Write a protein that binds this ligand. Structure first.
Ligand code: HEA
Ligand code: HEA
Ligand code: CUA
Ligand code: CUA
Ligand SMILES: [Cu+2]
Lengths: 236, 47, 534, 102, 59, 77, 60
């Protein structure tokens, strides 16, 4: 969604992959929190007891059976936490019935997005520009580092591929709500699979160094109704 | 080359000196602690 | 009189000189990082008139200075050349000329990097120098060449020091010492030196290739001309991750030595974890590529990389539990080394927890390059390096000087750095979950309060550094007073309820080496007789 | 590796045969109390006579208050009470009437 | 030879710094490596002396 | 595009698609510039180079062919 | 190996002597790889080039 001051929770999920990965990470961090509490209680009880320890033991070395017990415990624990991770990665890395494509090859210090999948009037591609709004241009109705010249429209309820590349320097297409982020090598070409489920406005930025104007390279996307989106791609 | 007991001479500085009783060299150390970032800012911008 | 401080054939002078250089670099880096955080204290231009070019110039200066001139030189050189050939019974270490050459090629690096940072163009690509991000078109001038030369000379110095340590271990071993039962510090330095010898040359070759690209204007890694910068990216990864091991493992050995010489009990599974550390050193060449999950590798390759990266993560927990057992069943004292080690281990457990959270590849898609990754490595590197160095200094200052250090000043120092680190690092969880966008001179003002508390913690750290230098002055001026009275700790370990006062007085330390009861560093001719052990 | 423990005991008595000062008594007491084994009254009396070979009543205080506070052992008291009572009545070392009322 | 023994005897009977080995080379190098070094180092950082005095003030 | 235009990915399921457009375009060019009458055999993978492949590279190749100078390492025949 | 390599070098590596003067009829099919802008060069006097090799570019 939109970053907020003093936030306490992750933004609303925009794609089913996002909700799935966040839930699986929530379970993983649940396990991580319980083991961290384990270690914390270890440290607390040990220091509290041994701040006045009468005798210092010296002749306990290996305990081979219980040693291999806590040696094989982490292996099975990580395998257990990796099986859902295994199935999640196996499902996410594949693309199942993609519908259309949107591409973003941004130049140096600013973003450029391509809508070649949709035809403006007849055959011709859809292409527009988007530049940052500085403090001088920051008038009544724009946001600093969050408002760009033109927003990026997304087809709601439609499987969408992100064929992303760059021209001069690697530019990071970042949309945290959609759970999408791929560094775009200028010479290479990368695509990922996603689909937006709800209607809303999301903001992004460039989480990869560009140059002098790396900072003022935001990403401003949005979602509208399907007739409105089709009409916008028709007029533009 | 083999006349160092190793009690106070291990430090690469001379403790003796009325002009610098570890007061002028260490004040220079104070100055150079923040000197490089200040001059780096001053070359292109203002502090 | 100047040959001692310019042509030091003895290792101790070089060790203390490396310590001075590293502490100078560290204080400069801390001050300029305070300046940077003040710039990032509030969005806008309050002290620096924007200048994102300058912003990234000081950002890369921050990173490069602390990585290459604070953590590396002293933390390995001093401990190595002061313990590794001394405890084994060798009379004097070999290759003084090599160490002097390394020292005297260092100022080339310092001056060249200062000039590179102090030019109008400058290099500001950060710790990552992958082209065309590091291209000469944006960062013109001589900055790239000077940085490359500094990289080359620092790599040469570290590689030669590692070679000297390795040959000393292999040849200068005393007759009465088995190889399987070497102390954890010796094996730690052994693994670190071999990993450095197998890692630095690759990065040096890559840096030389980039220098050739920048000078002769050829086409190897530029996007135009059919180049592949991902080769140098992989080279930098296979440097940094083994370099992370290089920075951390000697800290592990130092903590092991501290706990062994303090807790008065053996380390649980000492030989077993010596074998485990050997396995870590042998298998470190397989988990270097868990950061490139998004470059465009195959799914099977992702599976292999993630499998390796969480199958080599068990020994961290093994060491945690082994040191927990080492402090278990024994006597723990309210001394600064105990608390330093405890804080380091706890924050390292959280850092490893975050890393394990990062181990998954599916979550990386929405988690990579977010705030969580930078928070994670700031956690691990910061606590590891800084607390290991602090514990080493506060544990080794009476070993090399013999002049006692105040207990009260040390405790208040620990409390200051500890509270600063906690107040800085606790909100990073919320910062990561919201998605603070990294490396922005003018970030959105939503994170204003968190930036304020981070700036407060950074300023606490800077006043703590002022306390450090004032503590050094206090020691230099009142070591005699500290020896006279009880204002400073006199003995490392407290007696148990078994020992008489006279017996403990004549048995003050029962450790694994004579260094503790070795008199204040003697002349250049020490250990005139071989060490016998049974 | 659950090694033998009577070997270290026999080492204690053979060092008693070679005992030359209270230093050896301190060393053997520290080594014995360091182990997880609870000393039987026989070895306790051997340690007591080793400490008394120099006739040092403070060492008797040390060994008695160490027996009273050697190992928690799930908070064993009554056995400790009877053992201290008999190792006191054998010779007589009244000290608990002084430090306790403090 | 007929000069190595004499040189060794001279060194044994007179222990002095600088090895008493390259006097002409020392006179050709060290005073030159001082004066010419100053002459080649100082102008590089003395050219901006006229420009020196930047207060970062603009109108 | 109601969640289904080409079905499951078969041309190249992997995320990286660097050497993807050239193969999808060479066959189309060969089928087009050989008689100029029938394009039925090569009338099924339009979306391969229309949506899956960027159109910027396609239009760059078209302009290069029109101007008579090509940048790719291809063969005249 | 040395003598046969010398023979093949004398045979097949001597056709570039006349490359200086050649009609623009068999020129290779070039593209953006060549004839591109570079950093302006101010050092020197002769042709403003790093080395006096006026054979790298055949276009005036
Ligand atoms: C070596 C690891 C390391 C350490 C320890 C630190 C420490 C810190 N780092 Fe940094 N940091 C990096 C590695 C590290 N960092 C890297 C790789 C980057 C990314 C680089 C980039 O992309 O360019 C980065 C980037 C980075 C940024 C991003 C820059 C931006 O775009 O604005 C910021 C932001 O403020 C930051 C802050 C800090 C802070 C506040 C600390 C604090 O922990 C500082 C506290 C440290 C001290 C306590 C030092 C004490 C000094 C002494 C005198 C030592 C005394 C010891 C003895 C000799 C006895 N770091
Ligand atoms: C001190 C050094 C250090 C340590 C110890 C670790 C520990 C770990 N690190 Fe990290 N890491 C770095 C240094 C370190 N890291 C640096 C510098 C980077 C930045 C590089 C780059 O990406 O730019 C980085 C980044 C980084 C990434 C990059 C994320 C992305 O792709 O962008 C990943 C991803 O997998 C990762 C993983 C791990 C893992 C799995 C561990 C684990 O080994 C942690 C081990 C600890 C535990 C095991 C937890 C405690 C013990 C237990 C509770 C035992 C039981 C639990 C289990 C066995 C499951 N690290
Ligand atoms: Cu960007
Ligand atoms: Cu960017
Ligand atoms: Cu790794």
């Amino acid at each position: 969604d939109v970053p907020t001051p003093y936030a306490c929770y992750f933004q609303d999920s925009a794609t089913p992959n996002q909700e799935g990965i966040l839930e699986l990470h929530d379970n993983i961090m649940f396990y991580l929190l319980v083991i961290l509490g384990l270690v914390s209680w270890m440290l607390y009880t040990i220091v509290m007891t041994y701040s006045k320890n009468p005798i210092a033991y010296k002749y306990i070395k290996h305990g081979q059976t219980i040693e291999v017990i806590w040696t094989i415990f982490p292996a099975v624990i990580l395998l257990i936490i990796a099986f859902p991770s295994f199935i999640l990665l196996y499902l996410c890395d594949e693309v199942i019935s993609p519908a259309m494509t949107i591409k973003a090859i941004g130049y140096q210090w600013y973003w450029k997005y391509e809508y070649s999948d949709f035809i403006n009037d007849s055959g011709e591609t859809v292409e527009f520009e988007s530049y940052v709004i500085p403090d001088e241009l920051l008038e009544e109705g724009q946001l600093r580092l969050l408002d760009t010249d033109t927003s990026m429209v997304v087809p709601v309820d439609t499987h969408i591929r992100f064929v992303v590349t760059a021209a001069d320097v690697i530019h990071d297409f970042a949309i945290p709500s959609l759970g999408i982020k791929v560094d775009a090598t200028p010479g290479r070409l990368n695509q990922v699979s996603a689909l937006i489920q709800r209607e809303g406005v999301f903001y992004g930025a460039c989480s990869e160094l560009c140059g002098t104007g790396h900072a003022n390279m935001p990403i401003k996307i949005e979602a509208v109704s399907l007739p409105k989106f089709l009409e916008w791609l028709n007029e533009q | 080359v083999h006349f160092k007991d190793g009690v106070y001479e291990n430090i690469p500085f001379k403790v003796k000196g009325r002009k610098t009783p570890y007061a002028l060299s260490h004040f220079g150390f104070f100055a150079i602690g923040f000197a490089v970032p200040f001059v780096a800012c001053y070359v292109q911008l203002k502090k | 009189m100047v040959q001692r401080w310019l042509y030091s054939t003895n290792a101790k002078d070089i060790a203390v000189l490396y310590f001075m250089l590293a502490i100078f670099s560290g204080m400069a880096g801390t001050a300029m990082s305070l300046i940077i955080r003040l710039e990032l204290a509030a969005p806008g231009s309050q002290y620096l008139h924007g200048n994102s070019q300058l912003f990234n110039v000081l950002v890369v200066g921050h990173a490069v200075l602390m990585i290459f001139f604070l953590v590396m030189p002293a933390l390995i050189g001093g401990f190595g050349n002061y313990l590794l050939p001394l405890m084994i019974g060798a009379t004097d270490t070999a290759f003084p000329r090599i160490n002097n050459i390394a020292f005297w090629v260092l100022p080339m690096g310092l001056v060249c990097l200062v000039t590179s940072t102090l030019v109008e163009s400058g290099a500001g690509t950060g710790w990552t120098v992958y082209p065309p991000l590091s291209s000469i078109q944006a960062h013109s001038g001589p900055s790239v060449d000077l940085a490359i030369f500094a990289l080359h000379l620092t790599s040469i110095s570290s590689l030669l020091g590692a070679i000297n340590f390795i040959v000393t271990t292999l040849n200068m071993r005393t007759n009465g010492m088995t190889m399987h039962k070497l102390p954890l510090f010796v094996w730690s330095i052994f693994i670190t030196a071999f990993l450095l010898l197998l890692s630095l040359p690759v990065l040096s070759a890559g840096i030389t290739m980039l220098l050739l690209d920048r000078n002769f204007n050829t086409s190897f890694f530029e996007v135009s001309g059919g180049g592949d910068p991902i080769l140098y990216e992989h080279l930098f990864w296979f440097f940094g991750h083994p370099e992370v091991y290089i920075l951390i493992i000697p800290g592990f050995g130092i903590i092991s030595h501290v706990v062994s010489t303090y807790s008065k009990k053996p380390v649980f599974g000492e030989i077993s974890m010596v074998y485990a550390m050997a396995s870590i050193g042998l298998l470190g060449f397989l988990v270097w590529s868990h950061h490139m999950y998004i470059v465009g590798l195959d799914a099977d390759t992702r599976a292999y990389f993630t499998s390796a990266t969480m199958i080599i993560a068990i020994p961290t927990g093994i060491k945690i539990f082994s040191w927990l057992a080492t402090i278990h069943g024994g006597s723990i004292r309210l001394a600064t080394p105990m608390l330093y080690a405890i804080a380091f281990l706890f924050l390292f457990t959280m850092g490893g927890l975050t890393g394990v959270a990062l181990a998954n590849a599916s979550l990386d898609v929405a988690f990579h390059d977010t705030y969580y990754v930078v928070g994670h490595f700031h956690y691990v590197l910061s606590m590891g390096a800084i607390f290991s160095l602090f514990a080493g200094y506060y544990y080794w200052s009476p070993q090399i000087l013999g002049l006692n250090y105040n207990e009260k000043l040390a405790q208040i120092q620990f409390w200051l750095i500890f509270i600063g680190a906690n107040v800085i690092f606790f909100p990073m969880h919320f910062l990561g979950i919201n998605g603070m966008p990294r490396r922005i001179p003018d970030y959105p003002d939503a994170f204003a309060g968190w930036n304020y508390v981070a700036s407060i913690g950074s300023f606490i750290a800077t006043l703590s550094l002022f306390l450090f230098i004032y503590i050094l002055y206090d020691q230099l001026v009142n070591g005699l007073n500290n020896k006279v009275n009880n204002k400073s700790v006199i003995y490392n370990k407290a007696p148990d309820f078994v020992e008489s006062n006279t017996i403990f007085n004549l048995n003050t330390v029962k450790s694994s080496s004579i260094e503790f009861l070795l008199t204040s560093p003697p002349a250049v001719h020490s250990f005139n007789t071989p060490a016998v052990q049974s | 590796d659950e090694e033998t423990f009577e070997e270290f005991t026999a080492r204690y008595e053979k060092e008693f045969d070679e005992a030359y000062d209270l230093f050896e008594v301190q060393r053997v007491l520290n080594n014995c109390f360091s182990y997880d084994l609870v000393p039987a009254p026989a070895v306790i009396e051997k340690a007591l006579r080793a400490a008394r070979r120099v006739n040092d009543l403070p060492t008797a205080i040390r060994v008695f208050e160490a027996l009273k506070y050697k190992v928690e052992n799930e908070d064993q008291y009554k056995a400790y009470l009877d053992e201290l009572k008999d190792v006191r009545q054998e010779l007589g070392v009244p000290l608990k009437e002084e430090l306790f009322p403090s | 030879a007929n000069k190595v023994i004499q040189l060794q005897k001279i060194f044994q009977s007179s222990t002095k710094p600088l090895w008493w080995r390259h006097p002409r080379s020392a006179l050709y190098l060290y005073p030159f490596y001082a004066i010419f070094a100053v002459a080649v180092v100082t102008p590089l950082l003395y050219i901006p002396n006229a420009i020196r005095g930047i207060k970062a003030k603009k109108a | 595009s109601p969640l289904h235009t080409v079905g499951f990915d078969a041309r190249f399921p992997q995320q990286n698609q660097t050497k993807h457009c050239w193969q999808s375009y060479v066959d189309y060019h060969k089928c087009v510039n050989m008689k100029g009458e029938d394009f039925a055999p090569c009338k099924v993978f339009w979306k391969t180079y229309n949506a899956l492949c960027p159109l910027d590279w396609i239009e760059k190749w078209d302009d290069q062919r029109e101007k008579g100078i090509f940048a790719g390492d291809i063969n005249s025949d | 190996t040395a003598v046969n390599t010398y023979f093949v070098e004398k045979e097949h590596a001597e056709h570039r002597e006349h490359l200086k003067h050649v009609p623009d009829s068999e020129w290779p099919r070039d593209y953006e790889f060549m004839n591109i802008r570079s950093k302006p060069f101010f050092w020197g006097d002769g042709d403003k080039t790093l080395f006096w090799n006026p054979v790298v570019n055949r276009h005036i």
